[PDB]
Amino acid sequence: GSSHHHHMPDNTIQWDKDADGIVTLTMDDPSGSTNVMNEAYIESMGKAVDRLVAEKDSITGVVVASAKKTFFAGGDVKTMIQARPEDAGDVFNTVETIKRQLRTLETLGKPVVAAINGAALGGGLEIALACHHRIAADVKGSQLGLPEVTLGLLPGGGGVTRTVRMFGIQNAFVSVLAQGTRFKPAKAKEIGLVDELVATVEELVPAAKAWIKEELKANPDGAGVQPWDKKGYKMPGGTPSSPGLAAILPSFPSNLRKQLKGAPMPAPRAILAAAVEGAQVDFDTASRIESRYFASLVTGQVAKNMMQAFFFDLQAINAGGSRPEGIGKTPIKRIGVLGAGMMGAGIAYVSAKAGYEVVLKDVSLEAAAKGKGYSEKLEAKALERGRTTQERSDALLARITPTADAADFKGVDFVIEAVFENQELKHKVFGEIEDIVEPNAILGSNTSTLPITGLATGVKRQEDFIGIHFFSPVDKMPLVEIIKGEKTSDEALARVFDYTLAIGKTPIVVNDSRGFFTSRVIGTFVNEALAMLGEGVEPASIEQAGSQAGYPAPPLQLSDELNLELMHKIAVATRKGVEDAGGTYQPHPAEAVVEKMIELGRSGRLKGAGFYEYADGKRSGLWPGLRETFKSGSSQPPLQDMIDRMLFAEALETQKCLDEGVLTSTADANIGSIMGIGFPPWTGGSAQFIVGYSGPAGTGKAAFVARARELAAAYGDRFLPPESLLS
């Protein structure tokens, strides 16, 4: 009935009542390294809460502690990703039972303190929010937040309801819920998520029991009573019926639709709905509304896409899914970057930011110095916004050593070349340092299109030659595409793999092939837009299709940052890659658009003119002569056709890479597409998009093939699905 149990599992909570009647509930799931809101937890907390009510006469307070390195993190993702639409009634009852436990604990008539020893994320923070006082240990690696929205979910264990009761609708949504922001213990105390801090975890339980002793003495009537359960309660910022809040409340959905740019991510929409609708009723009714919106997301497809990508796929990557087995660790003592352009300067910064000593070489000391200036300008912004100290900023920049002499590469055991995209140039640049660096030094190249095997011949130690592909701006792009040439050893792979994690980025391992995976797939994205421009579609509709598809940057704007030179060279280079095999390279329609833009002198932001206009280096609207050039407006396809043309182009090209053996896992394909080239997070990756496609044709791989064949009939046979996607 109205129970604390859901309906064998292991017990996860240890019970301890002291002589003062303070019961210490220590969470310690023996089936894993972290306390997780799984079926074993629900049953254990069900027993514990039952016992707190049974022994209410001999209990004066409750402390919630943990025996793990973290406090409590996350729920049962393995179960929520399997929840079909018919299972909605079960997902509802699960979070309803979870919150019925926390509500009983919250209304126990006695103070309940949370002893946060480490990370309290998602459901972990939700348990803490049910307590009346929160004490956190100010240790390294500790984070607090409600990151459910990042997995396509929402805080359905009371996170939405309580943060709104604690902070009001506007503050709780923007600061906590909408983006799942993570806070360090100091920041968490600052905004109100934590009540006080301690220096070490050992002080937690003693300080918690001390706060109970003082609360019972100083506040006897308000002990164990939340602010929203005290009468006369006024919600911060007001209720939706308050005139001050009702004046700005209609602008919250439109602001959210501007931030999302029309992308079909339903999780933030549901969080705002549950937040506002919950503030209109009592606490218990607000929590049940939160349960219904939660079950709506879990049984939906986007949540399954984002759970698959940002939980299962990402963990498999971080767990060395693509790292060769058996290979051990190898230290990195001196990183030598060749080239001080925007790429090398970003590589030098993220390496020095990770603590590495960097030797930044160029062809002139003037040039290498301007590269370090990129790190100085970034540190100035970080000092201005108060995100780093003056001491660490000095230590970071002190690790970068600009130079123009190849002799300064002595002691380098990790070379990262980022010079101009040309084979014989890279051969020359590597030849004059390969004998100066250490004999086991990794020889990495940041090429975007040239095959790694062809570059590897320029060195004698071809076994240590490997592609290390970054993305601009390097200081913010989170992926490193690791390309494996035919001569590249598995040790070099693992060493670059470990380096990628060391500098705080995510790796994927790609076999050597022209265009690799990121450059090849993002080419199809741009080529679809340029085709639509030549076909006569309005440039504004093209950019809107890109932003509303979920991309971080519209296609034409991206086409000016990549510059049509690097774009046109792929056309002639990919042509000859299969030209010499009896293969017929069928020219892409977009090639005519690239050349006519170069003919008109508009090649990108680097030139200062492209599809947009750039006034003193700032983009300022689409180039007005664009409509007359390509007769824009003469073709008006459905916006959803433009959106699907770009998504399906990348999704089909990804399937080719998996078929050709360019990629070895769908996890690399999904995370690589998301973190590497900017594939929309709601898709779950350019491979998850196929199995999670949803439209008028239905949902699944079959619906994808149907929609692909539909686009093929209308726009060209390039949208025909591969054999591997069929029955």
């Binding site: 209609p250 959905p253 439109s254 959210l256 740019k261 609708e277 509303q548």
Partner: protein, 394 residues
């Protein structure tokens, strides 16, 4: 079956928003004052034959809540059998009340009906009633809620209406409204508001700035609502914001009443019909642009009455925004000398719930003053709706 006739059509002057004369006047008092004026016009009228009182009101809260139509029936001492119902179809509530009154008379189950509307925007600002399309995030996120001023600027952007073009219409509205007052056009229909002592409170339309110049209109200044609109209208790169407080409808207080009944009902009470309700129509359009409802509703009311644009002597479209009227004029090719001939809401104000009945009675007077035959009255609406009505002089 029955034919519906207009016997009386009066209104209060429109008081301005800031330091308005009608700000101290409760909206109920505005309606009761017009009821008392109708009694002065026909003291022998058997009020027992009045079977309903239908008022439009967009913000029926506070001073305008609790079925203000029924309040007017009781406070004015009308018979208790005289009904009283409030309705809200946003900007068309005034004309929807008149249309419903006519339809109730045509059905034969109502004999003599009082219609109109009331809106005291200085006391009950719009939005005071809340609502789902604005205060429920689940449905607000789905209907693409965008304020109407942005839809008007979007219309100007697409149709190529420049800032000078909308300001040119705004100047014309001020001139035509000033000429109408000076010519005595409004002498009989605008009933001055007085207090409980007979002292005058207001006798003219305060929002009018008859000394407007094109140079003064140019000195005026025009949430992610802009990005929300362009998400649907994706082929538009940027919205040219041309509408200011000088080329948009004024926020005012006012009320209006219209007496409607069958030919038998008027003859029994010694009334003389002034115009006949020929046809009514309702149509809609895109709610994100929120101002394209008039065109399909005017076309529908023309086809329903077997008439064309050439058969209509006067066109009266509410001046919510200058681009809306220019768009309407461009689509139907309305002659310039037939459109809002006595000025509109840009000059005189737009008291939401009352406007439809005001501009309706304005055409009843101008058809008689010009000795013309037909007039077509239409209003754009929030949410993408639209109402239209054709009257014929008798």
């Amino acid at each position: 079956s029955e034919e519906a006739f207009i016997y009386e059509a009066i209104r209060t002057p429109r008081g301005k928003q800031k330091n308005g004369s009608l700000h101290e006047v409760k909206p109920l008092s505005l309606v009761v004052g017009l009821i008392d004026e109708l009694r002065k016009r026909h003291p022998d009228l058997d009020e027992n034959l009045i079977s309903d009182v239908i008022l439009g009101c967009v913000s029926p809260v506070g001073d305008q809540g609790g079925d203000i139509a029924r309040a007017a029936v009781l406070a004015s001492g009308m018979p208790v059998t005289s009904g009283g119902v409030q309705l809200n179809r946003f900007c068309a509530s005034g004309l929807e009340a008149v249309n419903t009154a006519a339809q109730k008379v045509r059905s034969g189950w109502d004999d003599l009906v009082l219609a109109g509307g009331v809106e005291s925007m200085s006391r009950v600002p719009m939005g005071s009633d809340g609502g789902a399309m604005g205060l429920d995030p689940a449905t607000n996120y789905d209907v693409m809620f965008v304020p109407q001023s942005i839809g008007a600027d979007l219309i100007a952007t697409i149709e190529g209406f420049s800032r000078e073009d909308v300001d040119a219409y705004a100047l014309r509205s001020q001139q035509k409204a000033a000429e109408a007052w000076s010519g005595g056009y409004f002498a009989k229909s605008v009933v001055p508001v007085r207090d409980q002592n007979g002292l005058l409170i207001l006798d003219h339309d305060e929002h009018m700035r008859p000394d407007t110049t094109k140079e003064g209109l140019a000195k005026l200044k025009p949430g992610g609502f802009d990005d929300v609109a362009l998400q649907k209208y994706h082929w538009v790169e940027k919205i040219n914001h041309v509408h200011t407080g000088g080329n948009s409808s004024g926020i005012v207080d006012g009320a209006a009443l219209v007496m409607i009944g069958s030919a038998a009902a008027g003859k029994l009470q010694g009334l003389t019909p002034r115009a006949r309700i020929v046809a009514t129509a309702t149509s809609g359009a895109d709610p994100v642009i929120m101002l394209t409802g008039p065109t399909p509703a005017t076309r529908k009311v023309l086809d329903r009455a077997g008439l064309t644009v050439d058969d209509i002597d006067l066109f009266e479209l509410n001046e919510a925004f200058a681009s809306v009227v220019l768009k309407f004029q461009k689509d139907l090719n309305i002659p310039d000398e037939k459109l809002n001939v006595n000025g509109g809401a840009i000059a005189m104000g737009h008291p939401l719930g009352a406007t439809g009945a005001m501009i309706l009675g304005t055409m009843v007077d101008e058809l008689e003053r010009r000795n013309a035959r037909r007039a077509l009255i239409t209003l754009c609406i929030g949410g993408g709706m639209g109402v239209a009505t054709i009257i014929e002089r008798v």
